[PDB]
Each structure stands twice: as structure tokens, then as C-alpha cells.
JSON list of C-alpha atoms and ligand atoms in Angstrom, two decimals:
[
{"chain": "Y", "resi": 1, "resn": "UNK", "atom": "CA", "xyz": [0.00, 0.00, 0.00]},
{"chain": "Y", "resi": 2, "resn": "UNK", "atom": "CA", "xyz": [0.87, 3.68, -0.19]},
{"chain": "Y", "resi": 3, "resn": "UNK", "atom": "CA", "xyz": [0.18, 5.30, 3.17]},
{"chain": "Y", "resi": 4, "resn": "UNK", "atom": "CA", "xyz": [-0.20, 9.03, 3.50]},
{"chain": "Y", "resi": 5, "resn": "UNK", "atom": "CA", "xyz": [0.66, 10.63, 6.78]},
{"chain": "Y", "resi": 6, "resn": "UNK", "atom": "CA", "xyz": [-2.37, 12.80, 7.56]},
{"chain": "Y", "resi": 7, "resn": "UNK", "atom": "CA", "xyz": [-3.29, 10.30, 10.31]},
{"chain": "Y", "resi": 8, "resn": "UNK", "atom": "CA", "xyz": [-1.04, 8.03, 12.42]},
{"chain": "Y", "resi": 9, "resn": "UNK", "atom": "CA", "xyz": [0.20, 5.11, 10.27]},
{"chain": "Y", "resi": 10, "resn": "UNK", "atom": "CA", "xyz": [-1.39, 2.33, 12.35]},
{"chain": "Y", "resi": 11, "resn": "UNK", "atom": "CA", "xyz": [-1.46, -1.07, 10.68]},
{"chain": "Y", "resi": 12, "resn": "UNK", "atom": "CA", "xyz": [-2.70, -4.55, 11.59]},
{"chain": "Y", "resi": 13, "resn": "UNK", "atom": "CA", "xyz": [-0.11, -7.17, 12.42]},
{"chain": "Y", "resi": 14, "resn": "UNK", "atom": "CA", "xyz": [-0.22, -10.86, 13.27]},
{"chain": "Y", "resi": 15, "resn": "UNK", "atom": "CA", "xyz": [2.24, -12.06, 15.85]},
{"chain": "Y", "resi": 16, "resn": "UNK", "atom": "CA", "xyz": [2.38, -14.98, 18.30]},
{"chain": "Y", "resi": 17, "resn": "UNK", "atom": "CA", "xyz": [-0.97, -16.14, 16.93]},
{"chain": "Y", "resi": 18, "resn": "UNK", "atom": "CA", "xyz": [-2.60, -12.82, 17.86]},
{"chain": "Y", "resi": 19, "resn": "UNK", "atom": "CA", "xyz": [-3.96, -9.91, 15.83]},
{"chain": "Y", "resi": 20, "resn": "UNK", "atom": "CA", "xyz": [-2.63, -6.58, 17.06]},
{"chain": "Y", "resi": 21, "resn": "UNK", "atom": "CA", "xyz": [-2.28, -2.99, 15.83]},
{"chain": "Y", "resi": 22, "resn": "UNK", "atom": "CA", "xyz": [1.00, -1.14, 15.68]},
{"chain": "Y", "resi": 23, "resn": "UNK", "atom": "CA", "xyz": [2.44, 2.19, 14.57]},
{"chain": "Y", "resi": 24, "resn": "UNK", "atom": "CA", "xyz": [4.83, 2.30, 11.57]},
{"chain": "Y", "resi": 25, "resn": "UNK", "atom": "CA", "xyz": [7.55, 4.42, 13.17]},
{"chain": "Y", "resi": 26, "resn": "UNK", "atom": "CA", "xyz": [10.53, 5.50, 11.09]},
{"chain": "Y", "resi": 27, "resn": "UNK", "atom": "CA", "xyz": [11.87, 7.24, 14.21]},
{"chain": "Y", "resi": 28, "resn": "UNK", "atom": "CA", "xyz": [12.21, 3.91, 16.05]},
{"chain": "Y", "resi": 29, "resn": "UNK", "atom": "CA", "xyz": [15.27, 1.72, 15.44]},
{"chain": "Y", "resi": 30, "resn": "UNK", "atom": "CA", "xyz": [13.58, -1.35, 16.92]},
{"chain": "Y", "resi": 31, "resn": "UNK", "atom": "CA", "xyz": [10.14, -2.95, 17.05]},
{"chain": "Y", "resi": 32, "resn": "UNK", "atom": "CA", "xyz": [8.57, -2.94, 20.55]},
{"chain": "Y", "resi": 33, "resn": "UNK", "atom": "CA", "xyz": [5.29, -4.67, 21.32]},
{"chain": "Y", "resi": 34, "resn": "UNK", "atom": "CA", "xyz": [3.31, -5.08, 24.53]},
{"chain": "Y", "resi": 35, "resn": "UNK", "atom": "CA", "xyz": [1.62, -8.25, 25.74]},
{"chain": "Y", "resi": 36, "resn": "UNK", "atom": "CA", "xyz": [2.71, -10.96, 23.36]},
{"chain": "Y", "resi": 37, "resn": "UNK", "atom": "CA", "xyz": [3.54, -14.47, 24.37]},
{"chain": "Y", "resi": 38, "resn": "UNK", "atom": "CA", "xyz": [6.22, -15.60, 22.00]},
{"chain": "Y", "resi": 39, "resn": "UNK", "atom": "CA", "xyz": [7.74, -19.09, 22.12]},
{"chain": "Y", "resi": 40, "resn": "UNK", "atom": "CA", "xyz": [11.47, -19.76, 21.99]},
{"chain": "Y", "resi": 41, "resn": "UNK", "atom": "CA", "xyz": [14.54, -18.01, 23.31]},
{"chain": "Y", "resi": 42, "resn": "UNK", "atom": "CA", "xyz": [14.91, -14.45, 24.51]},
{"chain": "Y", "resi": 43, "resn": "UNK", "atom": "CA", "xyz": [17.45, -12.27, 26.30]},
{"chain": "Y", "resi": 44, "resn": "UNK", "atom": "CA", "xyz": [16.89, -9.10, 28.30]},
{"chain": "Y", "resi": 45, "resn": "UNK", "atom": "CA", "xyz": [17.69, -5.77, 26.63]},
{"chain": "Y", "resi": 46, "resn": "UNK", "atom": "CA", "xyz": [17.71, -2.19, 27.87]},
{"chain": "Y", "resi": 47, "resn": "UNK", "atom": "CA", "xyz": [16.11, 0.40, 25.58]},
{"chain": "Y", "resi": 48, "resn": "UNK", "atom": "CA", "xyz": [15.14, 4.09, 25.78]},
{"chain": "Y", "resi": 49, "resn": "UNK", "atom": "CA", "xyz": [17.69, 5.89, 27.95]},
{"chain": "Y", "resi": 50, "resn": "UNK", "atom": "CA", "xyz": [15.70, 9.01, 28.87]},
{"chain": "Y", "resi": 51, "resn": "UNK", "atom": "CA", "xyz": [14.87, 9.03, 32.66]},
{"chain": "Y", "resi": 52, "resn": "UNK", "atom": "CA", "xyz": [16.43, 5.62, 33.00]},
{"chain": "Y", "resi": 53, "resn": "UNK", "atom": "CA", "xyz": [16.13, 2.61, 30.77]},
{"chain": "Y", "resi": 54, "resn": "UNK", "atom": "CA", "xyz": [13.25, 0.24, 30.05]},
{"chain": "Y", "resi": 55, "resn": "UNK", "atom": "CA", "xyz": [13.99, -3.51, 30.13]},
{"chain": "Y", "resi": 56, "resn": "UNK", "atom": "CA", "xyz": [12.38, -5.62, 27.41]},
{"chain": "Y", "resi": 57, "resn": "UNK", "atom": "CA", "xyz": [12.69, -9.19, 26.19]},
{"chain": "Y", "resi": 58, "resn": "UNK", "atom": "CA", "xyz": [14.55, -9.51, 22.88]},
{"chain": "Y", "resi": 59, "resn": "UNK", "atom": "CA", "xyz": [13.34, -12.34, 20.62]},
{"chain": "Y", "resi": 60, "resn": "UNK", "atom": "CA", "xyz": [15.32, -12.84, 17.46]},
{"chain": "Y", "resi": 61, "resn": "UNK", "atom": "CA", "xyz": [14.00, -14.13, 14.15]},
{"chain": "Y", "resi": 62, "resn": "UNK", "atom": "CA", "xyz": [10.33, -13.90, 15.00]},
{"chain": "Y", "resi": 63, "resn": "UNK", "atom": "CA", "xyz": [7.83, -14.55, 12.20]},
{"chain": "Y", "resi": 64, "resn": "UNK", "atom": "CA", "xyz": [5.46, -11.61, 11.98]},
{"chain": "Y", "resi": 65, "resn": "UNK", "atom": "CA", "xyz": [2.88, -10.52, 9.43]},
{"chain": "Y", "resi": 66, "resn": "UNK", "atom": "CA", "xyz": [2.62, -6.79, 8.81]},
{"chain": "Y", "resi": 67, "resn": "UNK", "atom": "CA", "xyz": [-0.23, -5.50, 6.72]},
{"chain": "Y", "resi": 68, "resn": "UNK", "atom": "CA", "xyz": [-0.32, -8.95, 5.04]},
{"chain": "Y", "resi": 69, "resn": "UNK", "atom": "CA", "xyz": [3.46, -9.14, 4.45]},
{"chain": "Y", "resi": 70, "resn": "UNK", "atom": "CA", "xyz": [5.00, -12.20, 6.15]},
{"chain": "Y", "resi": 71, "resn": "UNK", "atom": "CA", "xyz": [8.51, -11.41, 7.36]},
{"chain": "Y", "resi": 72, "resn": "UNK", "atom": "CA", "xyz": [11.03, -12.34, 10.07]},
{"chain": "Y", "resi": 73, "resn": "UNK", "atom": "CA", "xyz": [12.77, -10.02, 12.52]},
{"chain": "Y", "resi": 74, "resn": "UNK", "atom": "CA", "xyz": [13.76, -9.11, 16.02]},
{"chain": "Y", "resi": 75, "resn": "UNK", "atom": "CA", "xyz": [10.81, -8.17, 18.25]},
{"chain": "Y", "resi": 76, "resn": "UNK", "atom": "CA", "xyz": [11.29, -6.59, 21.67]},
{"chain": "Y", "resi": 77, "resn": "UNK", "atom": "CA", "xyz": [8.46, -7.41, 24.04]},
{"chain": "Y", "resi": 78, "resn": "UNK", "atom": "CA", "xyz": [7.85, -5.17, 27.00]},
{"chain": "Y", "resi": 79, "resn": "UNK", "atom": "CA", "xyz": [6.22, -2.00, 28.22]},
{"chain": "Y", "resi": 80, "resn": "UNK", "atom": "CA", "xyz": [5.55, 0.64, 25.62]},
{"chain": "Y", "resi": 81, "resn": "UNK", "atom": "CA", "xyz": [2.79, 3.29, 25.44]},
{"chain": "Y", "resi": 82, "resn": "UNK", "atom": "CA", "xyz": [2.04, 2.12, 21.89]},
{"chain": "Y", "resi": 83, "resn": "UNK", "atom": "CA", "xyz": [3.00, -0.95, 19.82]},
{"chain": "Y", "resi": 84, "resn": "UNK", "atom": "CA", "xyz": [5.67, 0.20, 17.39]},
{"chain": "Y", "resi": 85, "resn": "UNK", "atom": "CA", "xyz": [7.03, -1.32, 14.16]},
{"chain": "Y", "resi": 86, "resn": "UNK", "atom": "CA", "xyz": [10.55, 0.09, 13.89]},
{"chain": "Y", "resi": 87, "resn": "UNK", "atom": "CA", "xyz": [13.00, 0.37, 11.00]},
{"chain": "Y", "resi": 88, "resn": "UNK", "atom": "CA", "xyz": [14.25, -3.17, 11.60]},
{"chain": "Y", "resi": 89, "resn": "UNK", "atom": "CA", "xyz": [10.94, -4.68, 10.34]},
{"chain": "Y", "resi": 90, "resn": "UNK", "atom": "CA", "xyz": [10.10, -1.89, 7.91]},
{"chain": "Y", "resi": 91, "resn": "UNK", "atom": "CA", "xyz": [13.23, -2.88, 5.98]},
{"chain": "Y", "resi": 92, "resn": "UNK", "atom": "CA", "xyz": [12.02, -6.48, 5.84]},
{"chain": "Y", "resi": 93, "resn": "UNK", "atom": "CA", "xyz": [8.68, -5.54, 4.30]},
{"chain": "Y", "resi": 94, "resn": "UNK", "atom": "CA", "xyz": [10.41, -3.23, 1.79]},
{"chain": "Y", "resi": 95, "resn": "UNK", "atom": "CA", "xyz": [8.85, -0.09, 3.20]},
{"chain": "Y", "resi": 96, "resn": "UNK", "atom": "CA", "xyz": [10.38, 3.20, 1.94]},
{"chain": "Y", "resi": 97, "resn": "UNK", "atom": "CA", "xyz": [9.69, 6.92, 2.45]},
{"chain": "Y", "resi": 98, "resn": "UNK", "atom": "CA", "xyz": [8.87, 8.60, -0.85]},
{"chain": "Y", "resi": 99, "resn": "UNK", "atom": "CA", "xyz": [8.53, 12.25, -1.85]},
{"chain": "J", "resi": 1, "resn": "UNK", "atom": "CA", "xyz": [13.77, 10.77, -3.22]},
{"chain": "J", "resi": 2, "resn": "UNK", "atom": "CA", "xyz": [13.01, 7.21, -2.23]},
{"chain": "J", "resi": 3, "resn": "UNK", "atom": "CA", "xyz": [14.55, 6.61, 1.20]},
{"chain": "J", "resi": 4, "resn": "UNK", "atom": "CA", "xyz": [15.16, 3.10, 2.42]},
{"chain": "J", "resi": 5, "resn": "UNK", "atom": "CA", "xyz": [15.14, 2.50, 6.13]},
{"chain": "J", "resi": 6, "resn": "UNK", "atom": "CA", "xyz": [18.34, 0.53, 6.75]},
{"chain": "J", "resi": 7, "resn": "UNK", "atom": "CA", "xyz": [19.79, 3.66, 8.38]},
{"chain": "J", "resi": 8, "resn": "UNK", "atom": "CA", "xyz": [18.05, 6.51, 10.24]},
{"chain": "J", "resi": 9, "resn": "UNK", "atom": "CA", "xyz": [16.24, 8.76, 7.71]},
{"chain": "J", "resi": 10, "resn": "UNK", "atom": "CA", "xyz": [18.20, 11.94, 8.52]},
{"chain": "J", "resi": 11, "resn": "UNK", "atom": "CA", "xyz": [17.73, 14.75, 5.98]},
{"chain": "J", "resi": 12, "resn": "UNK", "atom": "CA", "xyz": [19.04, 18.29, 5.56]},
{"chain": "J", "resi": 13, "resn": "UNK", "atom": "CA", "xyz": [16.64, 21.15, 6.24]},
{"chain": "J", "resi": 14, "resn": "UNK", "atom": "CA", "xyz": [16.82, 24.94, 5.98]},
{"chain": "J", "resi": 15, "resn": "UNK", "atom": "CA", "xyz": [14.99, 26.85, 8.66]},
{"chain": "J", "resi": 16, "resn": "UNK", "atom": "CA", "xyz": [15.32, 30.38, 10.11]},
{"chain": "J", "resi": 17, "resn": "UNK", "atom": "CA", "xyz": [18.26, 30.97, 7.75]},
{"chain": "J", "resi": 18, "resn": "UNK", "atom": "CA", "xyz": [20.27, 27.97, 9.05]},
{"chain": "J", "resi": 19, "resn": "UNK", "atom": "CA", "xyz": [21.10, 24.52, 7.69]},
{"chain": "J", "resi": 20, "resn": "UNK", "atom": "CA", "xyz": [20.22, 21.76, 10.11]},
{"chain": "J", "resi": 21, "resn": "UNK", "atom": "CA", "xyz": [19.70, 18.00, 10.01]},
{"chain": "J", "resi": 22, "resn": "UNK", "atom": "CA", "xyz": [16.58, 16.28, 11.22]},
{"chain": "J", "resi": 23, "resn": "UNK", "atom": "CA", "xyz": [15.01, 12.83, 11.47]},
{"chain": "J", "resi": 24, "resn": "UNK", "atom": "CA", "xyz": [11.95, 11.99, 9.28]},
{"chain": "J", "resi": 25, "resn": "UNK", "atom": "CA", "xyz": [9.78, 10.49, 12.02]},
{"chain": "J", "resi": 26, "resn": "UNK", "atom": "CA", "xyz": [6.45, 8.96, 11.11]},
{"chain": "J", "resi": 27, "resn": "UNK", "atom": "CA", "xyz": [5.96, 8.22, 14.83]},
{"chain": "J", "resi": 28, "resn": "UNK", "atom": "CA", "xyz": [5.93, 11.94, 15.68]},
{"chain": "J", "resi": 29, "resn": "UNK", "atom": "CA", "xyz": [2.75, 13.98, 15.23]},
{"chain": "J", "resi": 30, "resn": "UNK", "atom": "CA", "xyz": [4.65, 17.27, 15.37]},
{"chain": "J", "resi": 31, "resn": "UNK", "atom": "CA", "xyz": [7.96, 18.72, 14.19]},
{"chain": "J", "resi": 32, "resn": "UNK", "atom": "CA", "xyz": [10.32, 19.65, 17.07]},
{"chain": "J", "resi": 33, "resn": "UNK", "atom": "CA", "xyz": [13.62, 21.41, 16.53]},
{"chain": "J", "resi": 34, "resn": "UNK", "atom": "CA", "xyz": [16.23, 22.60, 18.98]},
{"chain": "J", "resi": 35, "resn": "UNK", "atom": "CA", "xyz": [18.07, 25.94, 18.78]},
{"chain": "J", "resi": 36, "resn": "UNK", "atom": "CA", "xyz": [16.42, 27.89, 16.01]},
{"chain": "J", "resi": 37, "resn": "UNK", "atom": "CA", "xyz": [15.71, 31.55, 16.08]},
{"chain": "J", "resi": 38, "resn": "UNK", "atom": "CA", "xyz": [12.47, 32.11, 14.31]},
{"chain": "J", "resi": 39, "resn": "UNK", "atom": "CA", "xyz": [10.94, 35.56, 13.83]},
{"chain": "J", "resi": 40, "resn": "UNK", "atom": "CA", "xyz": [7.31, 36.39, 14.50]},
{"chain": "J", "resi": 41, "resn": "UNK", "atom": "CA", "xyz": [4.69, 35.10, 16.88]},
{"chain": "J", "resi": 42, "resn": "UNK", "atom": "CA", "xyz": [4.72, 32.03, 19.09]},
{"chain": "J", "resi": 43, "resn": "UNK", "atom": "CA", "xyz": [2.80, 30.52, 21.99]},
{"chain": "J", "resi": 44, "resn": "UNK", "atom": "CA", "xyz": [3.95, 27.99, 24.58]},
{"chain": "J", "resi": 45, "resn": "UNK", "atom": "CA", "xyz": [2.88, 24.36, 24.12]},
{"chain": "J", "resi": 46, "resn": "UNK", "atom": "CA", "xyz": [3.25, 21.27, 26.32]},
{"chain": "J", "resi": 47, "resn": "UNK", "atom": "CA", "xyz": [4.36, 18.13, 24.48]},
{"chain": "J", "resi": 48, "resn": "UNK", "atom": "CA", "xyz": [5.38, 14.58, 25.43]},
{"chain": "J", "resi": 49, "resn": "UNK", "atom": "CA", "xyz": [3.54, 13.61, 28.58]},
{"chain": "J", "resi": 50, "resn": "UNK", "atom": "CA", "xyz": [5.73, 10.82, 29.90]},
{"chain": "J", "resi": 51, "resn": "UNK", "atom": "CA", "xyz": [7.58, 11.74, 33.18]},
{"chain": "J", "resi": 52, "resn": "UNK", "atom": "CA", "xyz": [6.02, 15.18, 32.95]},
{"chain": "J", "resi": 53, "resn": "UNK", "atom": "CA", "xyz": [5.66, 17.42, 29.95]},
{"chain": "J", "resi": 54, "resn": "UNK", "atom": "CA", "xyz": [8.21, 19.39, 27.96]},
{"chain": "J", "resi": 55, "resn": "UNK", "atom": "CA", "xyz": [7.38, 23.04, 27.14]},
{"chain": "J", "resi": 56, "resn": "UNK", "atom": "CA", "xyz": [8.21, 24.25, 23.62]},
{"chain": "J", "resi": 57, "resn": "UNK", "atom": "CA", "xyz": [7.45, 27.37, 21.58]},
{"chain": "J", "resi": 58, "resn": "UNK", "atom": "CA", "xyz": [4.85, 26.83, 18.89]},
{"chain": "J", "resi": 59, "resn": "UNK", "atom": "CA", "xyz": [5.40, 28.85, 15.70]},
{"chain": "J", "resi": 60, "resn": "UNK", "atom": "CA", "xyz": [2.68, 28.53, 13.08]},
{"chain": "J", "resi": 61, "resn": "UNK", "atom": "CA", "xyz": [3.13, 28.79, 9.33]},
{"chain": "J", "resi": 62, "resn": "UNK", "atom": "CA", "xyz": [6.91, 28.67, 9.29]},
{"chain": "J", "resi": 63, "resn": "UNK", "atom": "CA", "xyz": [8.63, 28.44, 5.91]},
{"chain": "J", "resi": 64, "resn": "UNK", "atom": "CA", "xyz": [10.99, 25.47, 5.92]},
{"chain": "J", "resi": 65, "resn": "UNK", "atom": "CA", "xyz": [12.88, 23.63, 3.22]},
{"chain": "J", "resi": 66, "resn": "UNK", "atom": "CA", "xyz": [13.17, 19.87, 3.65]},
{"chain": "J", "resi": 67, "resn": "UNK", "atom": "CA", "xyz": [15.47, 17.96, 1.41]},
{"chain": "J", "resi": 68, "resn": "UNK", "atom": "CA", "xyz": [15.00, 20.78, -1.18]},
{"chain": "J", "resi": 69, "resn": "UNK", "atom": "CA", "xyz": [11.18, 20.95, -0.87]},
{"chain": "J", "resi": 70, "resn": "UNK", "atom": "CA", "xyz": [9.97, 24.39, 0.24]},
{"chain": "J", "resi": 71, "resn": "UNK", "atom": "CA", "xyz": [6.91, 24.08, 2.44]},
{"chain": "J", "resi": 72, "resn": "UNK", "atom": "CA", "xyz": [5.07, 25.81, 5.31]},
{"chain": "J", "resi": 73, "resn": "UNK", "atom": "CA", "xyz": [4.10, 24.32, 8.63]},
{"chain": "J", "resi": 74, "resn": "UNK", "atom": "CA", "xyz": [3.99, 24.49, 12.38]},
{"chain": "J", "resi": 75, "resn": "UNK", "atom": "CA", "xyz": [7.41, 24.13, 14.03]},
{"chain": "J", "resi": 76, "resn": "UNK", "atom": "CA", "xyz": [7.83, 23.54, 17.76]},
{"chain": "J", "resi": 77, "resn": "UNK", "atom": "CA", "xyz": [11.11, 24.90, 19.07]},
{"chain": "J", "resi": 78, "resn": "UNK", "atom": "CA", "xyz": [12.51, 23.58, 22.31]},
{"chain": "J", "resi": 79, "resn": "UNK", "atom": "CA", "xyz": [14.41, 20.78, 23.94]},
{"chain": "J", "resi": 80, "resn": "UNK", "atom": "CA", "xyz": [14.54, 17.51, 22.08]},
{"chain": "J", "resi": 81, "resn": "UNK", "atom": "CA", "xyz": [17.31, 14.87, 21.96]},
{"chain": "J", "resi": 82, "resn": "UNK", "atom": "CA", "xyz": [16.96, 14.75, 18.15]},
{"chain": "J", "resi": 83, "resn": "UNK", "atom": "CA", "xyz": [15.61, 17.31, 15.62]},
{"chain": "J", "resi": 84, "resn": "UNK", "atom": "CA", "xyz": [12.49, 15.63, 14.30]},
{"chain": "J", "resi": 85, "resn": "UNK", "atom": "CA", "xyz": [10.35, 16.25, 11.21]},
{"chain": "J", "resi": 86, "resn": "UNK", "atom": "CA", "xyz": [6.90, 14.95, 12.18]},
{"chain": "J", "resi": 87, "resn": "UNK", "atom": "CA", "xyz": [3.86, 13.96, 10.15]},
{"chain": "J", "resi": 88, "resn": "UNK", "atom": "CA", "xyz": [2.66, 17.57, 10.05]},
{"chain": "J", "resi": 89, "resn": "UNK", "atom": "CA", "xyz": [5.52, 18.54, 7.67]},
{"chain": "J", "resi": 90, "resn": "UNK", "atom": "CA", "xyz": [5.82, 15.15, 5.97]},
{"chain": "J", "resi": 91, "resn": "UNK", "atom": "CA", "xyz": [2.28, 15.68, 4.67]},
{"chain": "J", "resi": 92, "resn": "UNK", "atom": "CA", "xyz": [3.29, 19.06, 3.26]},
{"chain": "J", "resi": 93, "resn": "UNK", "atom": "CA", "xyz": [6.21, 17.62, 1.25]},
{"chain": "J", "resi": 94, "resn": "UNK", "atom": "CA", "xyz": [3.98, 14.76, 0.03]},
{"chain": "J", "resi": 95, "resn": "UNK", "atom": "CA", "xyz": [5.93, 12.08, 1.85]},
{"chain": "J", "resi": 96, "resn": "UNK", "atom": "CA", "xyz": [4.30, 8.62, 1.93]},
{"chain": "J", "resi": 97, "resn": "UNK", "atom": "CA", "xyz": [5.18, 5.17, 3.28]},
{"chain": "J", "resi": 98, "resn": "UNK", "atom": "CA", "xyz": [5.28, 2.64, 0.45]},
{"chain": "J", "resi": 99, "resn": "UNK", "atom": "CA", "xyz": [5.53, -1.17, 0.45]},
{"chain": "X", "resi": 101, "resn": "LIG", "atom": "C1", "xyz": [5.80, 14.90, 21.39]},
{"chain": "X", "resi": 101, "resn": "LIG", "atom": "C2", "xyz": [6.81, 13.80, 21.02]},
{"chain": "X", "resi": 101, "resn": "LIG", "atom": "C3", "xyz": [7.96, 12.55, 20.59]},
{"chain": "X", "resi": 101, "resn": "LIG", "atom": "N1", "xyz": [7.65, 11.17, 21.03]},
{"chain": "X", "resi": 101, "resn": "LIG", "atom": "C4", "xyz": [6.81, 10.52, 21.84]},
{"chain": "X", "resi": 101, "resn": "LIG", "atom": "O1", "xyz": [5.93, 11.00, 22.53]},
{"chain": "X", "resi": 101, "resn": "LIG", "atom": "C5", "xyz": [7.04, 9.03, 21.80]},
{"chain": "X", "resi": 101, "resn": "LIG", "atom": "C6", "xyz": [6.06, 8.28, 22.72]},
{"chain": "X", "resi": 101, "resn": "LIG", "atom": "C7", "xyz": [5.97, 6.83, 22.30]},
{"chain": "X", "resi": 101, "resn": "LIG", "atom": "C8", "xyz": [6.75, 5.86, 22.97]},
{"chain": "X", "resi": 101, "resn": "LIG", "atom": "C9", "xyz": [6.67, 4.53, 22.55]},
{"chain": "X", "resi": 101, "resn": "LIG", "atom": "C10", "xyz": [5.82, 4.17, 21.48]},
{"chain": "X", "resi": 101, "resn": "LIG", "atom": "C11", "xyz": [5.05, 5.14, 20.80]},
{"chain": "X", "resi": 101, "resn": "LIG", "atom": "C12", "xyz": [5.12, 6.46, 21.21]},
{"chain": "X", "resi": 101, "resn": "LIG", "atom": "N2", "xyz": [6.73, 8.51, 20.46]},
{"chain": "X", "resi": 101, "resn": "LIG", "atom": "C13", "xyz": [7.54, 7.97, 19.54]},
{"chain": "X", "resi": 101, "resn": "LIG", "atom": "O2", "xyz": [7.07, 7.59, 18.48]},
{"chain": "X", "resi": 101, "resn": "LIG", "atom": "C14", "xyz": [9.04, 7.84, 19.77]},
{"chain": "X", "resi": 101, "resn": "LIG", "atom": "C15", "xyz": [9.86, 8.45, 18.62]},
{"chain": "X", "resi": 101, "resn": "LIG", "atom": "O3", "xyz": [9.37, 7.99, 17.34]},
{"chain": "X", "resi": 101, "resn": "LIG", "atom": "C16", "xyz": [11.37, 8.20, 18.64]},
{"chain": "X", "resi": 101, "resn": "LIG", "atom": "C17", "xyz": [11.76, 6.77, 19.11]},
{"chain": "X", "resi": 101, "resn": "LIG", "atom": "C18", "xyz": [12.94, 6.68, 20.08]},
{"chain": "X", "resi": 101, "resn": "LIG", "atom": "C19", "xyz": [12.73, 6.08, 21.34]},
{"chain": "X", "resi": 101, "resn": "LIG", "atom": "C20", "xyz": [13.79, 5.97, 22.26]},
{"chain": "X", "resi": 101, "resn": "LIG", "atom": "C21", "xyz": [15.07, 6.45, 21.92]},
{"chain": "X", "resi": 101, "resn": "LIG", "atom": "C22", "xyz": [15.28, 7.05, 20.66]},
{"chain": "X", "resi": 101, "resn": "LIG", "atom": "C23", "xyz": [14.22, 7.15, 19.74]},
{"chain": "X", "resi": 101, "resn": "LIG", "atom": "N3", "xyz": [12.02, 9.30, 19.40]},
{"chain": "X", "resi": 101, "resn": "LIG", "atom": "C24", "xyz": [12.01, 9.60, 20.71]},
{"chain": "X", "resi": 101, "resn": "LIG", "atom": "O4", "xyz": [11.37, 8.94, 21.53]},
{"chain": "X", "resi": 101, "resn": "LIG", "atom": "C25", "xyz": [12.78, 10.82, 21.21]},
{"chain": "X", "resi": 101, "resn": "LIG", "atom": "N4", "xyz": [13.73, 10.59, 22.30]},
{"chain": "X", "resi": 101, "resn": "LIG", "atom": "C26", "xyz": [13.80, 9.90, 23.44]},
{"chain": "X", "resi": 101, "resn": "LIG", "atom": "O5", "xyz": [14.85, 10.00, 24.04]},
{"chain": "X", "resi": 101, "resn": "LIG", "atom": "C27", "xyz": [12.75, 9.02, 24.08]},
{"chain": "X", "resi": 101, "resn": "LIG", "atom": "C28", "xyz": [13.20, 7.89, 24.79]},
{"chain": "X", "resi": 101, "resn": "LIG", "atom": "C29", "xyz": [12.28, 7.04, 25.41]},
{"chain": "X", "resi": 101, "resn": "LIG", "atom": "C30", "xyz": [10.91, 7.36, 25.34]},
{"chain": "X", "resi": 101, "resn": "LIG", "atom": "C31", "xyz": [10.50, 8.50, 24.63]},
{"chain": "X", "resi": 101, "resn": "LIG", "atom": "N5", "xyz": [11.41, 9.31, 24.03]},
{"chain": "X", "resi": 101, "resn": "LIG", "atom": "C32", "xyz": [13.87, 11.47, 20.32]},
{"chain": "X", "resi": 101, "resn": "LIG", "atom": "C33", "xyz": [14.16, 10.85, 18.92]},
{"chain": "X", "resi": 101, "resn": "LIG", "atom": "C34", "xyz": [13.63, 13.01, 20.16]}
]
């Protein structure tokens, strides 16, 4: 799709057998989702850095469907005010900024 | 331009007679720049909302050139870790997300 930016670019995703919504965020390096039970291995990771850090669980090579595009990438699971698809997964789906 | 997202989408801008760099951030509603002297009227605005708010100066209808595209939009001037071009100015330059 071509998504204009008059509203927040919120898309539907499928992850961990769940349907969720997330924001396509070119300002975010990483993808951070709340409340997903993913199977397989993880390691803790500190993100943010303003006011302290936030600890999340880093799962590598997670299958995720974004707006119908099935890809694989690192998903950080932990507290976040909004589910965010970061550049790491936008590259996988071939998403570009165009003007 | 078509901008892939393997690196941070940092672009050159011209604002208030100065060259600056800023991040194209589809996760940001508003454009927030640090250290620009803009002429004409402003009003204070509270932004963020996590840990407290940050106060910035809101300047409406500011001429700004972004990656060579001359547009007009609201620019918030105040503290920010990164100069950010938000959706408000990405709409003006006709920037879309495409995949
Ligand atoms: C007004 C305003 C700017 N941002 C906001 O209010 C936040 C709130 C939010 C947090 C998580 C998910 C969705 C939304 N929204 C964003 O989309 C974040 C923004 O796209 C990006 C993503 C990011 C996060 C951490 C470090 C570096 C970059 N930017 C930022 O968050 C900004 N800097 C930060 O230091 C920061 C750190 C931790 C939380 C919030 N902010 C700077 C770039 C100015």
C-alpha cells in the first residue's frame, strides 16, 4: 500500500498467533510490542535511555505478518505506550519513504 | 527521493536561515527542533507527557525547506534529543510510506 501521513500510520499485524495494531515508526530503530507471548529463546535488553532505561525481552527471528506481508525479525516485548514497528521490520517488508 | 530504512532517515533542512539536520519520524505527530531563532509570533505548548511534559514554543506557518522541498508548517522549538520532522511537515512535502 501507499500510506499518506495525515493520520497516524497504524497497521494490523499478526504475531504470536494474535492480531494486534502497531504504529509504523521511522523514528524507532527497533520494534517494541506489549503483551505478546512468544515461544522460543529471549534475552533481556535495555532500551530508551531518557529518565532511565526500560527492560524488554529480545526475541530474534520472530515470524510476523505486517499488513499482510510475512517477514522475520527481532521483536522486543515489554512495556511501551504504543506498539511500534521500527525500522528493523520496515526494511524487511520493503517499506520506503517517498517524496 | 526514495529513502530506504536501513539507516536513520536523517535529511538536511533549511529553517530560520540555518542549515540543520533532522530525522523523518512517522511516529511523531509534530515537528520539534532545537536551537532555532524564528521571527514572528509564538505561543507555549506542552508536548510529550511521559515523566512530565516538555514546554516548547509553537510557531505557526513557518517556511521550511526539507530535502529541497519548500513548504510551510507548524514548528515547535525547544528541547529535544533529536531534531524531528513529524507527520505535520511530511504531509506538506507529500511524503508517503510505500511497500
Ligand atoms: C511529542 C513527542 C515525541 N515522542 C513521543 O511521545 C514518543 C512516545 C511513544 C513511545 C513509545 C511508542 C510510541 C510512542 N513517540 C515515539 O514515536 C518515539 C519516537 O518515534 C522516537 C523513538 C525513540 C525512542 C527511544 C530512543 C530514541 C528514539 N524518538 C524519541 O522517543 C525521542 N527521544 C527519546 O529519548 C525518548 C526515549 C524514550 C521514550 C520517549 N522518548 C527522540 C528521537 C527526540
